[PDB]
Design a protein around this ligand. Sequence first.
Ligand code: GCP
Ligand code: PHE
Ligand code: MG
Ligand code: MG
Ligand code: MG
Ligand code: MG
Ligand code: MG
Ligand code: MG
Ligand code: MG
Ligand code: MG
Ligand code: MG
Ligand code: MG
Ligand code: MG
Ligand code: MG
Ligand code: MG
Ligand code: MG
Ligand code: MG
Ligand code: MG
Ligand code: MG
Ligand code: MG
Ligand code: MG
Ligand code: MG
Ligand code: MG
Ligand code: MG
Ligand code: MG
Ligand code: MG
Ligand code: MG
Ligand code: MG
Ligand code: MG
Ligand code: MG
Ligand code: MG
Ligand code: MG
Ligand code: MG
Ligand code: MG
Ligand code: MG
Ligand code: MG
Ligand code: MG
Ligand code: MG
Ligand code: MG
Ligand code: MG
Ligand code: MG
Ligand code: MG
Ligand code: MG
Ligand code: MG
Ligand code: MG
Ligand code: MG
Ligand code: MG
Ligand code: MG
Ligand code: MG
Ligand code: MG
Lengths: 392, 205, 85, 61, 82
Amino acid sequence: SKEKFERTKPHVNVGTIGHVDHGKTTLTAAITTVLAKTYGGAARAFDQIDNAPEEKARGITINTSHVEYDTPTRHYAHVDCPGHADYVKNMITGAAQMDGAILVVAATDGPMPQTREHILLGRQVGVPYIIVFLNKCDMVDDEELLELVEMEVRELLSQYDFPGDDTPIVRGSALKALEGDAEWEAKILELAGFLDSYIPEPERAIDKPFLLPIEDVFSISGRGTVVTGRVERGIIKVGEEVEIVGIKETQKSTCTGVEMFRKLLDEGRAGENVGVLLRGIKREEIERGQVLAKPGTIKPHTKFESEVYILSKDEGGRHTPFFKGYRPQFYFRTTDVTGTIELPEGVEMVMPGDNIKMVVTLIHPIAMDDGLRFAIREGGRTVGAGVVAKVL
Amino acid sequence: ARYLGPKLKLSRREGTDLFLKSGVRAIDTKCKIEQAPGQHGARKPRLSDYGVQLREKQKVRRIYGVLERQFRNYYKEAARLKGNTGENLLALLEGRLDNVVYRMGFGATRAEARQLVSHKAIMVNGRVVNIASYQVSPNDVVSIREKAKKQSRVKAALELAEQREKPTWLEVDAGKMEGTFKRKPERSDLSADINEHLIVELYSK
Amino acid sequence: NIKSAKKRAIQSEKARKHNASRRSMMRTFIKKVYAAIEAGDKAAAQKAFNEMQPIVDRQAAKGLIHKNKAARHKANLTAQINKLA
Amino acid sequence: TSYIGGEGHNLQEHSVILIRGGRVKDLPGVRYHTVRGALDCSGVKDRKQARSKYGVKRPKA
Amino acid sequence: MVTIRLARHGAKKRPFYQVVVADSRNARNGRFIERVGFFNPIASEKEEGTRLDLDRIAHWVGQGATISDRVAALIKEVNKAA
RNA sequence: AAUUGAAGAGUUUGAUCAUGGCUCAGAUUGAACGCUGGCGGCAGGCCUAACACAUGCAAGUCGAACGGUAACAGGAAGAAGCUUGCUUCUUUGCUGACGAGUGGCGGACGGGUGAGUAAUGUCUGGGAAACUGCCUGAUGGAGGGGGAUAACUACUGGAAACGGUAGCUAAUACCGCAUAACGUCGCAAGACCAAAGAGGGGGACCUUCGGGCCUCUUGCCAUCGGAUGUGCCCAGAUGGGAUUAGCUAGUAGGUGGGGUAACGGCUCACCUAGGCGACGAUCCCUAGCUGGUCUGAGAGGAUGACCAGCCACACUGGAACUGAGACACGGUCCAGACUCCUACGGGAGGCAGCAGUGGGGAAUAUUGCACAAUGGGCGCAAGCCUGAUGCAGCCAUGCCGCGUGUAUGAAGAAGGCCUUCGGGUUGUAAAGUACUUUCAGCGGGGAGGAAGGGAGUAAAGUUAAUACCUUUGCUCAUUGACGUUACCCGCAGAAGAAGCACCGGCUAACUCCGUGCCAGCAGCCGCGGUAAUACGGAGGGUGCAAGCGUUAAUCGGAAUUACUGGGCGUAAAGCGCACGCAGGCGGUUUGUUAAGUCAGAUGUGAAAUCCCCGGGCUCAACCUGGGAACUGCAUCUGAUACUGGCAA
RNA sequence: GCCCGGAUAGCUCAGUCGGUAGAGCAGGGGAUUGAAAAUCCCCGUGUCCUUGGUUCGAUUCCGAGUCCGGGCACCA
Ligand SMILES: Nc1nc2c(ncn2[C@@H]2O[C@H](COP(=O)(O)OP(=O)(O)CP(=O)(O)O)[C@@H](O)[C@H]2O)c(=O)[nH]1
Ligand SMILES: *C(=O)[C@@H](N)Cc1ccccc1
Ligand SMILES: [Mg+2]
Ligand SMILES: [Mg+2]
Ligand SMILES: [Mg+2]
Ligand SMILES: [Mg+2]
Ligand SMILES: [Mg+2]
Ligand SMILES: [Mg+2]
Ligand SMILES: [Mg+2]
Ligand SMILES: [Mg+2]
Ligand SMILES: [Mg+2]
Ligand SMILES: [Mg+2]
Ligand SMILES: [Mg+2]
Ligand SMILES: [Mg+2]
Ligand SMILES: [Mg+2]
Ligand SMILES: [Mg+2]
Ligand SMILES: [Mg+2]
Ligand SMILES: [Mg+2]
Ligand SMILES: [Mg+2]
Ligand SMILES: [Mg+2]
Ligand SMILES: [Mg+2]
Ligand SMILES: [Mg+2]
Ligand SMILES: [Mg+2]
Ligand SMILES: [Mg+2]
Ligand SMILES: [Mg+2]
Ligand SMILES: [Mg+2]
Ligand SMILES: [Mg+2]
Ligand SMILES: [Mg+2]
Ligand SMILES: [Mg+2]
Ligand SMILES: [Mg+2]
Ligand SMILES: [Mg+2]
Ligand SMILES: [Mg+2]
Ligand SMILES: [Mg+2]
Ligand SMILES: [Mg+2]
Ligand SMILES: [Mg+2]
Ligand SMILES: [Mg+2]
Ligand SMILES: [Mg+2]
Ligand SMILES: [Mg+2]
Ligand SMILES: [Mg+2]
Ligand SMILES: [Mg+2]
Ligand SMILES: [Mg+2]
Ligand SMILES: [Mg+2]
Ligand SMILES: [Mg+2]
Ligand SMILES: [Mg+2]
Ligand SMILES: [Mg+2]
Ligand SMILES: [Mg+2]
Ligand SMILES: [Mg+2]
Ligand SMILES: [Mg+2]
Ligand SMILES: [Mg+2]
Ligand SMILES: [Mg+2]
């Protein structure tokens, strides 16, 4: 749902990432609470984010929960993420829409093994502007090592070619601010400043033939199937005949309803991370990885050409080259379709560090196009990055 | 719906010249007729009882260009009328508008007549009709609609009908392009090379 | 359920309290007669009958008793006492 | 018990499939046929004739 | 209560009302006492199109049939003079 | 004019004739699945879980019944800025209207579903022991008073729901009294029983200036009718099982009391001891019934989706109330199971209404538009409401129509396939060339579904009246969801539109290659063991066509349940034999009756559907007028041969 | 989406507790037959489910992925 969306601000996607126990979800609770002071209707509590029983008991956020808040300049759709190695699947999907993350790194442990993996993946997917947040500052007050941690953080951003020195570092206690300690409360608002400044109002392609990647299928009690997604291109209005193209045979449906954050919204448009209600499509039918497109504009494929860059072993990557037939996992927009590498002639061992190319045949027909950038992971680390060179 | 394939191959299967490609030419002569229905067409068939009944149904159907579901209806219509099941079946095929246009000479072939009726160029009693399956009632006048009158296809085809039988049951103006369909066609006037008896024997079982 | 015609719920309950009171008073005059029949008093029974007659008949006019039920009470109850008187 | 028509299949101890009637008369006691092309059972590989039966889709090219 | 009213028969976009005498507490195409005439609103400029057996109708008016206005509009159209 | 209609084949055998099953050729379907897929028209669309249900909506209406006016807009007294009448603006039910409340009507219709029901139901034909709002006919009345209550106030409980206490007021709300009759009770005399007022206009007169008085419309009461609907009773018909033979104790009937609108063991007390049953009771399983649908030459067989009639149910079980009518889908009360809210005291809900969700399933649709039309409720009407209905959406689910082009064209091309390597075949097919443009796409025109209703006006009734009202004409502005409609014209270009199964026999159409009892095919018989017209591919051909096949289902063929229309020596089938109850059948003559039979007539056999001759959508499907038919049933009037009863 | 198991020739199973993979039934091959059966004379006939690391070496050690089975969560 009720209460139609009032389109007033520019919609920017942001979200916390970083090592486990550094305060990703507490901050997300903390933001919405502090921002409630400058904004009437908000304040998602901590348990409101960690509502899952495992998240309740184990005390770890394993499901990317989408919250929102706004400075009276922009509109923020915040996607909290699972800094838990075995939960990469979720992080990528969240970081895929990430138009500038909020890197949470505790003063207590400084940079961590998982903070290293996040930045790497952040770079792979293409998360442009990383705000940083030194949490647990209430813990230590030794401003020397505070500066030494702040130093080592920039050092990591450095080797991952993000502009580390010119990157905003915000100190603060996400915890204490949550109760309302006016002292640490301001530190939140300080990051809010870089949240509107450091990040610009992104470029959108609203005039393109509509396209929507599907991150999570919902079964609303009484309405049916709700496919969630950030509109990559074009717009969509309720009633517009859309049809699913993806990892199974294409079906047809119709946007019977479009919403965002339980707020009804008649017309969705590029960049907006909306939920779309579909015309009689059961849950087992449509599932994550498929794409939601305007009829006939895009069809699936299982053959193409691309490029590959293998980073060093002490940065993740590989140390031992691979031969023909090596099959990694292709991550593009919302997937992990595993496919076979059809190497070029005489290429016996593809040494870690090349920027040559290869050809692929995979297991799931998927929505393609030349110029489609995609990561390539394997064994708890990225191995390569490549863009669709040409359709084969 | 329509056949629209190699329409002279049909004449080779049935044996007789079914006027499908009658056209401007007088005699076919260029299809290697009578001895080649296909690859193994040099051979003679066993031609059983079901075979002679089937071929007799096809020969009649291939001429008027009707399809099975529609041809089954004409029989079912003739079977419930009075008179004779076989003769009335032919009276229904001789009443079709695409057949009349062929009989009036306004079109060269029955397909061309079907092309003429379908492309809104045939009018009956001052009414435009598209359906080639229009059942022309007795004492009706049919004519080419003014707009597409005498346009390179009717003129050549109307001259072609000079070299035909020019049937009794229907009168044609030939000058103002307006045929006059009188009483229903009699059996003694039509085809006669075909057998209506066998079609009833096919649909009886 | 939610219909603005839930008025018929309370209106019928406002009527059943009324109609019950009238069916109650009708039966007290009818049973008053049978009390006089068990006593065999053809004068006392005739008294109660000449007193319950207008009460049982005015209900036919109010639409409560179906006029045939009232006519049946005047029929048999008379048939009772005329055998007694 | 049901028969699996067509040369080659992939059914294995599970995999829900569809069943249509029709005896075989080659196996005593088999009165059904599995529908190739329906459910988790894939169609016959490389059919070019009679592909309505055997669940084979017409060639892309 | 008996009522002389129409009854929507015919195909889609091509109605054909049959003026009939039925009880007022029934469906449009429900149980009726007796049908009396009809009314084709889009017949044609032809030989027929509207008939009402005015003798049987007038019998029910004497009985207490409440004729609908649409039918009472048709009694005027089949003139009690011509 | 109204049944002009009836087919066979494969397979047991070395072969034959019988008997005998199995299978196929036809039609059909609420269909599902696979491949494929251009459009339109008309229909259909949860067959399974009567499973559980988020959200919205499906029954409201009248100020011409009444007290009121909380809102919105005016009228009016006054008020304040200020262009002293431009406005600001507080009072005020005084009008238009109108929340909440009292009251009247509807809510028992319309819509859905098929769980239950084997007879309490349905169908058919009769019957008497009944009631019947709205509608309408005839005959009369419609006199005179009183006591309360909601809303509304003060206070107040409760989270909410929902109240509580004491006062104020009205009525077409409620209770009397008078008055009664062809009304009820009673053999009769006699006794007893009702009611309601509002609204429009208005001369004379009358006015405590509320209003009375005249007049018209409408409603109220009484009585008997008519019509419609409903309740009840009887007879026949209405599934399978005897591996269900005895069943019942308010049970069978009687008498009296009570009860119902009405008859009745419907219900009680007493009395009699009966009642149902082999012409199938009880019990068990299954099932809504019918008009009809499919099939059939017919007789029958299967079936009961859509349309329509009747019944039954409303989360489960039960009960009663209000009312003309329910023992009530969107009412009440209680209990139960399951969900939901909670301030933990207590409450809320019932999609088998339209959509929609999860689930189940091989499988079945939009959380759309409008009340314009038809019907209904209310109302004087205007109007308001109407998920009835009218339309649109979705799906090839079905029936019907159309299109994917036409004519010409031999070097009888290339390529593919076959070959006696000559050639044939694809194939006039293609290309080339000359034309056309349906339906799609695009841009303009454009019916019909619309009848009424509103305002004004004239005349005719009415009346004291040129008034009010009513009625019949006329005039002006109009009322369309579908709807960028059907249909017509215009522009461009062969342009955007052909698959599916089969090819051993049955059964229409054949060769080559690969695989060698392997892989596989198959409706039945059967193919495959290194020369496969049967397997897989290719070429060609055949059938059908936006469909085509496969599976499931019913009937047909099956005279393979034989009444029409079969059998029993040896093929399946004469009880081992006999006596014999019920039952079935029964020589011959006369008379009589008239149950069976027959003829005639009357009533009924709802409409739709089927059939016949016509009419309208460009044709068709579809709609539609008239008729026939509905092969049946009931009563009456006659015939008397044959059967039955009766008498000799 | 999370967690936990299973996958070794054509079929059915043994096997590791890092060391260059088995058993039986079948299958293929010669003689015999029209072709088989039986009899006689011969050959594992494996991507250890896939893939990449740890190492000289991975079925056996550790991570991604595929199909399946069981339990669990999520609800614009
Ligand atoms: N003293 C102190 N404790 C803190 C601070 N920030 C967080 N904590 C606590 O650290 C714990 C982890 O919170 P959480 O925010 O879920 O961590 P996470 O890093 O998002 C975990 P996941 O890996 O699942 O995404 C909570 O107990 C939080 O209250 C801080 O600034 N100071
Ligand atoms: C529904 O709110 C979407 N517009 C955004 C979203 C929120 C939570 C989880 C998934 C999608
Ligand atoms: Mg977290
Ligand atoms: Mg922990
Ligand atoms: Mg730690
Ligand atoms: Mg067709
Ligand atoms: Mg033999
Ligand atoms: Mg159902
Ligand atoms: Mg609900
Ligand atoms: Mg009101
Ligand atoms: Mg009903
Ligand atoms: Mg309180
Ligand atoms: Mg009263
Ligand atoms: Mg009397
Ligand atoms: Mg009075
Ligand atoms: Mg009595
Ligand atoms: Mg009885
Ligand atoms: Mg009695
Ligand atoms: Mg049942
Ligand atoms: Mg149904
Ligand atoms: Mg009922
Ligand atoms: Mg109940
Ligand atoms: Mg239910
Ligand atoms: Mg109700
Ligand atoms: Mg309901
Ligand atoms: Mg429903
Ligand atoms: Mg459903
Ligand atoms: Mg299912
Ligand atoms: Mg409403
Ligand atoms: Mg050649
Ligand atoms: Mg067009
Ligand atoms: Mg008009
Ligand atoms: Mg009009
Ligand atoms: Mg008018
Ligand atoms: Mg043949
Ligand atoms: Mg075959
Ligand atoms: Mg060969
Ligand atoms: Mg072959
Ligand atoms: Mg039979
Ligand atoms: Mg059969
Ligand atoms: Mg026999
Ligand atoms: Mg024998
Ligand atoms: Mg014997
Ligand atoms: Mg005897
Ligand atoms: Mg008799
Ligand atoms: Mg008789
Ligand atoms: Mg009838
Ligand atoms: Mg016609
Ligand atoms: Mg008749
Ligand atoms: Mg005798």
